Amino acid sequence: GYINAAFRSSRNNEAYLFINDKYVLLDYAPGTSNDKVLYGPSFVRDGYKSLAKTIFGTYGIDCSFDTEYNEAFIFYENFCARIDYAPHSDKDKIISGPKKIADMFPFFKGTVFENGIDAAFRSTKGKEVYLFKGDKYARIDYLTNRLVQNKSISDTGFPCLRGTIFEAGMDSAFASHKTNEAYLFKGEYYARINFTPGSTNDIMGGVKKTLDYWPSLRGIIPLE
Amino acid sequence: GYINAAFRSSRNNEAYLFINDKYVLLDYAPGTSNDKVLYGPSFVRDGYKSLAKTIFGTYGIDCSFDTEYNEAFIFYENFCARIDYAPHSDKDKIISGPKKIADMFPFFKGTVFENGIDAAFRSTKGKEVYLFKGDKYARIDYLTNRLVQNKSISDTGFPCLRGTIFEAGMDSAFASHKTNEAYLFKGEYYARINFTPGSTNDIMGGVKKTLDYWPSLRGIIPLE
Ligand SMILES: [Ca+2]
Ligand SMILES: [Ca+2]
Ligand SMILES: [Cl-]
Ligand SMILES: [Cl-]
Ligand SMILES: [Cl-]
Ligand code: NA
Numbered sequence A, B: 001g002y003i004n005a006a007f008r009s010s011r012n013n014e015a016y017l018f019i020n021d022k023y024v025l026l027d028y029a030p031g032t033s034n035d036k037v038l039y040g041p042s043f044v045r046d047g048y049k050s051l052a053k054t055i056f057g058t059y060g061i062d063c064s065f066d067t068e069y070n071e072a073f074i075f076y077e078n079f080c081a082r083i084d085y086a087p088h089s090d091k092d093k094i095i096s097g098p099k100k101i102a103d104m105f106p107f108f109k110g111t112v113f114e115n116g117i118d119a120a121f122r123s124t125k126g127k128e129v130y131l132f133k134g135d136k137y138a139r140i141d142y143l144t145n146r147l148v149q150n151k152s153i154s155d156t157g158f159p160c161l162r163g164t165i166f167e168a169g170m171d172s173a174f175a176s177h178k179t180n181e182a183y184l185f186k187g188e189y190y191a192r193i194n195f196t197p198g199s200t201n202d203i204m205g206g207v208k209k210t211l212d213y214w215p216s217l218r219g220i221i222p223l224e
Helices: A055-059 B057-060
Strands: A003-008 A014-019 A022-028 A034-045 A062-066 A071-076 A079-084 A093-100 A119-122 A127-135 A137-139 A172-175 A183-186 A189-194 B004-006 B014-019 B024-026 B036-043 B063-066 B069-075 B079-084 B093-100 B119-122 B129-132 B136-141 B172-175 B181-186 B189-194
Touching: A003 A071, A003 A119, A003 A183, A014 A172, A022 B119, A055 A071, A055 B093, A062 A127, A062 A172, A119 A183, A127 B057, B004 B069, B004 B119, B004 B181, B014 B172, B057 B069, B063 B172, B119 B181
Parallel strands: A003 A062, A003 A172, A062 A119, A119 A172, B004 B063, B004 B172, B063 B119, B119 B172
Antiparallel strands: A003 A014, A014 A022, A022 A034, A062 A071, A071 A079, A079 A093, A119 A127, A127 A137, A172 A183, A183 A189, B004 B014, B014 B024, B024 B036, B063 B069, B069 B079, B079 B093, B119 B129, B129 B136, B172 B181, B181 B189
16 A cells, blocks of 8 residues: 555645545655645545545545646546645535546547556646556647657656666656656655656656655555 | 336336436336336436436446335446435435445455446345346345355246346346336347246246337437
């Protein structure tokens, strides 16, 4: 039971992390630690009124990514929804869905992404998102609803992950409030990366143990 | 666009039929051809407002059975919920779920029923129910949450069904308010059967074309 999904809040330096059927709201304070739990751990169904009687409320959220304003796509197995997460209030609502992935994103039909997605993060470019499944990644535009390029190997688009535990897949991710940086998680490990839409990038600090650098998560992960 | 799910109402001679993402409430006037549409066709989304923001609202119901009082279990693929259908009123609500079938009914783990069920009808005996998947059927008690006997081929428990289209599966079923009768559906066909819990068992006037004997369904099946 490690971090299964995450997205960047519209609130500065804040991020929602999903673990099993629970979530935490974190001030992740980039470049220090110093990170601090703001809310949770609590059941998704308790913190998100609009998700209470849904599969997301029962089983939690296994992938997500922020889009714009106070909205985010959330996933569980082959299903997804777009929600308004109304940060710091009880006014969350389902905007679109819930739908199967294939009905929300027709271009994933007959692909490995059809039955579920491992992780995703929001790009700094237009309305683009990177999504990950097994050792593959996709790059999409969620507004025009299109695949920007062929699905390919994670290391083809992210050469800096060659030779690390992340080359074979990742469990969760979110974009930082710092431009062109992102966090990737897998088991007890994380990495902070600098990406640039195009190619040639780097890992800032290498693969670190998560609890060594996110002290706020000590009594939380791994969740029994 | 055929009947996918159905259950018997607590109100005398009324049944709910599910087709695609819609439903109809029928006075099905048994042993007779004076059935009549009490309500619908309507979207499940619209008739049951407790389901509007769930997978059941988006995709409809593919299996169902009444339990007792004003309750019924509903299914869509590997998911199910127990609902109060609060007949001839608003105020329908979810009681339990949505949950995976294997979480609601743990004895189905590792069986063909784990990922979905074709059809079901409530027994006259105790809190027993007959559920169908492919050419197999199960007998359960939903109150005690117990598989009552081994999973058997459908023709092992309903020999009368041998040599008919039903021997290989049912799309949909519900129990009649008439004691020990049930209706079975598949394609443009249906049968009415007299069953006897724990014994054998017969067919009432053979397989008939549905539209011939259920005129109130004229504009409704096949739905687009
Ligand atoms: Ca995940
Ligand atoms: Ca069915
Ligand atoms: Cl998944
Ligand atoms: Cl792609
Ligand atoms: Cl749902
Ligand atoms: Na998923």
